[PDB]
């Protein structure tokens, strides 16, 4: 009875533009999904889908290859659903996350640049030898339940 644990980092960067765009976009931002500490999650990740707000053209943004990121400009923050799909025949084939993109914070001295990061731990129960190999090539660690 083997249990495999893998870690993913979800984060974002946002910066006030020197000059707003013609449509009034005030900020440049990036949202990303990556492995911690030089672990390559491409061994076990097939693709990552970033679901942007309806206001953006073609909101369903797909990264099938690293880097897994979206870089955009805008005027407001929003909740971004994010789907990480696995290189697995069996279930689970995907995991769903939600990421809160925030562009600003209220502060005595204004800050032009912002960055945030979260650590998400994923647990797979009795994977196949092929998928286990994939998770462990990406820095996964196995415990016994």
């Amino acid at each position: 009875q083997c249990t495999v644990q893998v870690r993913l980092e979800l984060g974002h960067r946002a910066q006030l533009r020197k000059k707003p765009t013609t449509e009034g976009f005030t900020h440049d931002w990036m949202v990303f999904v990556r492995g911690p500490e030089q672990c390559d999650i491409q061994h076990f990740v097939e693709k990552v889908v970033f679901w942007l707000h309806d206001s953006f053209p073609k909101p369903r943004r797909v990264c099938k290859e690293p880097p897994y990121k979206v870089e955009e400009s805008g005027y407001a923050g929003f909740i971004m659903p994010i789907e990480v799909h696995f290189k697995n025949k069996e279930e689970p084939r995907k995991v769903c996350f939600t990421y809160d993109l925030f562009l600003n914070l209220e502060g005595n001295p204004p800050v032009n640049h912002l960055n945030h990061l979260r650590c998400e731990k994923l647990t797979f129960n009795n994977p196949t030898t092929e998928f286990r190999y994939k998770l462990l090539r990406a820095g996964g660690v196995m415990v016994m339940p």
């Binding site: 407001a76 923050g77 929003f78 562009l103 600003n104 209220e106």
Partner: peptide, 4 residues
């Protein structure tokens, strides 16, 4: 502030 600005949210959507």
């Amino acid at each position: 502030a600005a949210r959507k």
